[PDB]
Design a binder for this molecule. Sequence first.
Ligand SMILES: CC(=O)NCC[C@H](N)C(=O)O
Ligand SMILES: CC(=O)NCC[C@H](N)C(=O)O
Lengths: 167, 167
Amino acid sequence: DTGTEVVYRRPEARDGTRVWELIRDTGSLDLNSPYCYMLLGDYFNDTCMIAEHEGDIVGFISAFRSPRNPETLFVWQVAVASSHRRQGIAKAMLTGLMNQKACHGVRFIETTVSPSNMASRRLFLGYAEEKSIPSTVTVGYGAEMFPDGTTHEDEPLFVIGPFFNDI
Amino acid sequence: DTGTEVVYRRPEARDGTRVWELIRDTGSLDLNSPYCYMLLGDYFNDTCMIAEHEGDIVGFISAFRSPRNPETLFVWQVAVASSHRRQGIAKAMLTGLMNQKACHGVRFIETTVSPSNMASRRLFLGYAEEKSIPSTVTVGYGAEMFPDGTTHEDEPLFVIGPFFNDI
Ligand SMILES: CC(=O)NCC[C@H](N)C(=O)O
Ligand SMILES: CC(=O)NCC[C@H](N)C(=O)O
């Protein structure tokens, strides 16, 4: 009611660079090219979300419906600017995302959560808990799959479901 | 017939790093994270292809079916190792890709070709020519959409079709 609440929308291609800058300043996230973020704004925007505060992007979530089993939504990246941690933005993006019309008929959410990303661990398990949906945590990608120089963590798989996301 | 022909297959998640290294050595391509290439091997592998020669990855093409209009296949990256230019690998990946069962019922191919990427300009317009399919070249992403520091070219849109890709 005073122009300082966080607002949520689908991205567009022209957001790509501002999304890229958010992911870049996070430091801790796996940065894709600016082009990749434009394509997500262009072709995957039905299953992605941006959070903004006072003209700045402060949050992003990317996801897609799995091409082979489109009842599975894969959540790719969740980012929240440093300056806006601990305000429920991640939970609000995820919740908003699942209420999008393009998530109709999703029965499982899959994602990968780095050991160090404790906020996401809480977001996904918390989501499932709150809606009383089963959750399963298993081996995802191991550290050793990543390039020799790099020093990447494991990416354990989190599966939420089965449930039925009705529109 | 002598173990030195180039071979073509769908990638898998565990190819992600070797794909990333190919894209990285290309220099000229927009490098995504290793994770992105793993996800393409994992979830989009039905519409992607790897080319190998003597145990080394020498080619990659990534593509996906557009979520909003799945009769459109978007071709994201086409890469051919420096050491294997001018051998028809790109044309063979593209041709192989379009013969995959997951490309059934595609009616349009969309992609973006950098002004400097003259091999891709030839690949896509050549493909359309050879199959007698219409092609259309229009404004895609402008240079100015890209991040301030970076020095990226335009990404003009190439649309091939309508046609009917029958299995
Ligand atoms: C759910 C989440 O936080 N997924 C993404 C992890 C991945 N390593 C990335 O940020 O690309
Ligand atoms: C068709 C092609 O060569 N597309 C990709 C261009 C893009 N800038 C990239 O390589 O990510």
